[PDB]
Design a protein around this ligand. Structure first.
Ligand code: MG
Ligand code: MG
Lengths: 45, 295, 101, 123, 132, 137
RNA sequence: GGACCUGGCGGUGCUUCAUAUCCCUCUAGAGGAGCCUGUUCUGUAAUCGAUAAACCCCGAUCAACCUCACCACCUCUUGCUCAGCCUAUAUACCGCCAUCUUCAGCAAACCCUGAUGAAGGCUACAAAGUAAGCGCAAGUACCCACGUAAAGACGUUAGGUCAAGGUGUAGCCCAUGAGGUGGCAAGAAAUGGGCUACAUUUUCUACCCCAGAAAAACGAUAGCCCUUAUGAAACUUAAGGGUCGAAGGUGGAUUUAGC
């Protein structure tokens, strides 16, 4: 049940009891891209 | 240093006493073999490389606390080898002033003996010096020295047994490829050979197999002088014939003279044929047949 | 949160096939015989055809359970050859070892 | 998914591309640690776990599970961002070297004392 | 060249443990399996379930103990009992270690419906088998 | 000096129902490690001898299941990696032991079963003729 | 400009060599025919990747639907996902590998020589080298100690894979995302590999090796028809049966593999 695993790990990460290093790297890359100026366009604009 | 080694020795003694307590053995007679068996039982590891398995067991430094080396040839860097050469040269001087199944040990054996590392030329020099020592009509005092560096380079025969019927017989076994055979040869007979309860000329319609069966008895000139009962399983006709041949020869060794046993061994009747089917490997058609090399 | 939309489709197919497994079994058993009248077999044929397409068990694909690879999946471990090689090489899989003979 | 995740070291090795065709013979990004400023038990939900992220005993009594208020969590996030910015500034800045005979020359540049000798010798 | 589960020597400076220093062709010979269960035996079932559970346990203990695990976990299964033996550094405080032990044991036991236990062996630093 | 003054024995009850008679149990343990199987065989043999149970031991021939996978990722069909799983067997044949003895011995040797070792115990159970089989209907 | 240092590549000879290896010699093949299969081309509205050795029954231990990433048509918009993308880049990478390798060298760290210049460090009746470590070796697996596997460093081809997966960069966000229905995939043709044979050391039958027949028949797993198996679906899959009995008559230069 990939839903169960993924949601449980995401909830644990949000509760601070699981340090998802992959998600930390992805969040850092997303923050750097947002600083650079690349961002998702608004849906249905 | 020696202090660390002594601490390790004391720790090993204490651990040996604990191991003897745990296994219920007598701490006095708890020897190294007992230690190894206890460790193997308590920590069962199936790693093939025996050096990687758990083990509980008991190089040094060549100078003391004052810095003075113990050996007068230490500064050569090869004190063991050069001390050995010095002793051999002294023995040669003494001999000069006063006047097979053994081989010389390999360089690895010499290095293990002298706990040092030696080049090929050093080994050759030492071997030539040893040969000169041997050729110098050296006495026993030097012959034992030579034998320190000497390394040594017959088929066991099953005994005769007796059955319920009263006949005297011997029994042996052999194998060839994937076929295993067990043969029983009686001391007295009429040349009858029965394989799996079937007469040999019926179980072996191929003449080559019958010739192979005849080969052992014919070699020692004993056709018709014995009776043989064989049970063979596995393999094909030729593998079964070869296995029966080997088993019959091994069993018949119990009735021929030692000279005939040696003659049969020299004729190959007793060596087990190690030639077995070689496994097919991935990326190629067979054991050795590669795929058609495209261009 | 499956690996890809293909794994999501396969999960949907598996769930729907499990839901409709008994109805399919009964109708197909009605079909796969020479005893019942041919007209009843024809109406059973149209009934089994009326069932949703994704309920057929043949559409179920054995994808790797960790990378959604459709091919090269060992059924015993349900893993692709690459992931299985990775786990076995790191030794995380009990018993499995390099074969030399 | 979850089983497709990897470790930080593997991700950095893949992203930085320290080896490859370009880096093989010379035919800019640098590694940054994301765990220097992260404390165990801290999440976006702002929960306080007794014994992991907050003291196990408060006023000599066993603490219970507590959740920081939205304003308190905003303050914590601001503190984390401030610490990250300060560390980034400190890493970016450097203690300027003392130039030798010229700015781009190596001569005259001090290298410090030589490495100490084995037999209790220091220089 | 074989690139699978090998550490390449560059300057003789990189420290590696016993596990990393050995290539896969040494598993049966020098380094036993990190997981021990009967699923992969002959005639036994549920090998895939055990593999998935082992992978999840490894990825979960790696993130639950960030920067604490000295080496890879050892997973043992005896009946329905599951035991995770972990070599951990002494960086973290014992209070946090005990909190994590209790939390992980309870959560894994409730998630996998089996009596999970966690045994931690502490080392001052990552044990170095050799340098590469 | 802190030895317990008096211990409590576990409750053992005797049931009027006749005990089950087991002619033979074949405890076939399968594993990946020969040394582990040897140690477990030593354990089981010592336990059975201390419990006064007639036990023999033999080793059924091992099984080796081998399979082959592509070594590379995209295309190197000529190059493969071969993996194998070794299932080694050890059969303990216990004879002429009662139902209670069989239960206690099996519990003792199964609680101490090492990880990575699977057990397949076959219990030959002696039975008398059914009531309705002595004579026809 | 002067003198040196490190230099190499040269379809440039000579002497030794290669051990299934460079040639001849040995055996069985490929190159002739059918069929199977992959590729290229043609064509289609209709994937991609692989492309001398090191691609070509390759990714696939596998495509009727699904698979599927293709095409046509229709449908959906915070979408299974704190979205998604099989969108571009293997010339950003991890990951896993090819290749010389059927190799034995790679080497840090020191020491010495040249006046402390780019450099060099060979002598065994030894004259400045030592070397950890890596690889070979060793050890281990299988049936030995043999053999086969496994192993096989550093480097080489900006070698292959962004379509195992992850990820850098860049792009799409009412679509380059998601879903449904339907559909390709043929032959003018060339090419690689495989199977079956061209028979008499054969074919059929019994048998599993003391036989009887056949012998211009030998020869299709191809074509057509039918049945059966699997499936919701067989025209496209497989098995069997019937029918048909064709090309073919040991194959050029060349070429593969085996101790
Ligand atoms: Mg300047
Ligand atoms: Mg097309």
């Amino acid at each position: 049940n990939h839903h169960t695993y993924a949601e449980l790990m995401q909830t644990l990460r949000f509760l601070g009891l699981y340090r998802d290093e992959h998600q930390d790297f992805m969040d850092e890359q997303k923050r750097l891209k947002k600083l650079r100026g690349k961002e998702k366009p608004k849906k249905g604009e | 240093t020696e202090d660390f080694i002594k601490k390790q020795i004391e720790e090993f003694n204490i651990g040996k006493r604990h191991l003897a307590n745990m296994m219920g053995e007598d701490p006095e007679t708890f020897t190294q073999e007992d230690i190894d068996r206890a460790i193997a039982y308590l920590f069962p590891s199936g790693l093939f490389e025996k050096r990687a398995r758990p083990v509980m067991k008991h190089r040094a430094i060549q100078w003391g606390e004052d810095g003075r080396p113990f050996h007068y040839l230490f500064y050569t860097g090869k004190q063991s080898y050069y001390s050995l050469m010095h002793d051999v040269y002294g023995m040669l001087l003494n001999l000069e002033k006063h006047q097979i199944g053994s081989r010389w040990l390999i360089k690895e054996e010499l290095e293990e003996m002298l706990v040092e590392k030696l080049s090929d030329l050093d080994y050759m020099q030492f071997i030539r010096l040893l040969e000169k020592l041997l050729t110098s009509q050296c006495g026993a005092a030097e012959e034992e020295f030579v034998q320190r560096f000497r390394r040594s380079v017959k088929q066991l025969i099953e005994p005769v047994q007796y059955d319920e019927q009263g006949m005297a017989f011997s029994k042996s076994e052999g194998k060839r490829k994937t076929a295993k055979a067990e043969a029983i040869v009686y001391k007295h007979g009429s040349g009858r050979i029965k394989v799996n309860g079937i007469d040999y000329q019926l179980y072996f319609p191929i003449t080559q197999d019958r010739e192979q069966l005849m080969f052992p008895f014919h070699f020692v000139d004993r056709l018709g002088k014995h009776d043989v009962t064989c049970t063979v399983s596995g393999g094909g006709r030729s593998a079964q014939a070869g296995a029966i041949r080997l088993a019959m020869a091994k069993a018949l060794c119990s009735f021929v003279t030692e000279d005939e046993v040696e003659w049969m061994r020299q004729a190959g009747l007793l060596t087990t044929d190690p030639r077995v089917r070689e496994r097919k490997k991935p990326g190629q058609e067979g054991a050795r047949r590669k795929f058609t090399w495209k261009k | 949160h499956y690996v890809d939309w293909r794994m999501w489709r396969d999960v949907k197919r598996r769930k729907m096939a499990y839901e409709y497994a008994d109805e399919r079994l009964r109708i197909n058993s009605l079909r796969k015989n020479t005893i019942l009248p041919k007209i009843l077999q024809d109406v059973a044929d149209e009934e089994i055809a009326a069932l949703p397409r994704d309920s057929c068990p043949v559409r179920i694909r054995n994808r790797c359970v960790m990378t959604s690879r459709p091919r090269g999946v060992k059924r015993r471990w349900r893993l692709s050859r690459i992931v299985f090689r990775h786990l076995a090489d790191h030794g995380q899989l009990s018993g499995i070892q390099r074969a030399t003979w | 998914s979850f089983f497709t995740k990897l470790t930080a070291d593997e991700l950095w090795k893949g992203a930085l591309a320290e080896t490859g065709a370009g880096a093989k013979k010379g035919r800019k990004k640098k590694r940054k640690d994301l765990n220097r400023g992260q404390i165990i038990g801290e999440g976006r939900y702002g929960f306080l776990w007794p014994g992991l992220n907050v003291p196990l005993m408060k006023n000599g009594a066993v603490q219970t599970i507590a959740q920081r208020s939205k304003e308190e969590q905003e303050k914590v996030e601001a503190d984390m961002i401030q610490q990250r910015e300060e560390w980034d500034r400190k890493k970016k800045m450097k203690v300027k070297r003392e130039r030798g005979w010229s700015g781009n020359s190596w001569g005259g540049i001090s290298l410090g004392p030589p490495d100490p000798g084995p037999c209790g010798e220091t220089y | 060249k074989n690139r699978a589960a090998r550490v390449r020597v560059s300057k003789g400076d990189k420290p590696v443990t016993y596990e990393e220093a050995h290539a896969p062709h040494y598993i049966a010979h020098r380094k036993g399996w990190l997981s021990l269960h009967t699923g992969n035996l002959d005639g036994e079932d549920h090998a895939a379930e055990r593999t998935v559970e082992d992978v999840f346990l490894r990825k979960f203990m790696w993130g639950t103990f960030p920067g604490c695990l000295a080496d890879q976990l050892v997973l043992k299964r005896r009946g329905n009992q599951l035991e995770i033996c972990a070599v951990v550094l002494r960086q973290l405080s014992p209070h946090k270690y005990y909190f994590l032990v209790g939390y992980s044991e309870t959560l894994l036991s409730y998630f996998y419906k089996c009596p999970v236990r966690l045994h931690l062996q502490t080392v001052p630093s990552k044990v170095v088998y050799k340098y590469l | 000096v802190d030895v317990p003054k008096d211990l409590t024995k576990p409750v053992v009850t005797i049931s009027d129902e006749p005990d089950i008679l087991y002619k033979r149990l074949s405890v076939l343990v399968k594993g990946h490690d020969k040394a582990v199987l040897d140690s477990y065989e030593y354990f089981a043999v010592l336990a059975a001898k201390e419990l006064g149970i007639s036990i023999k031991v033999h080793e059924p021939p091992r099984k080796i299941e081998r399979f082959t996978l592509l070594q590379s990722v995209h295309i190197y069909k000529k190059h493969r990696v071969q993996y194998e799983m070794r299932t080694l067997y050890r059969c303990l044949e216990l004879e002429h032991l009662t139902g209670s003895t069989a239960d206690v011995y099996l519990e003792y040797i199964q609680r101490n079963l090492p990880e990575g070792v699977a057990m397949e115990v076959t219990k030959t159970q002696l039975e008398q003729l059914p009531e309705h089989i002595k004579e026809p209907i």
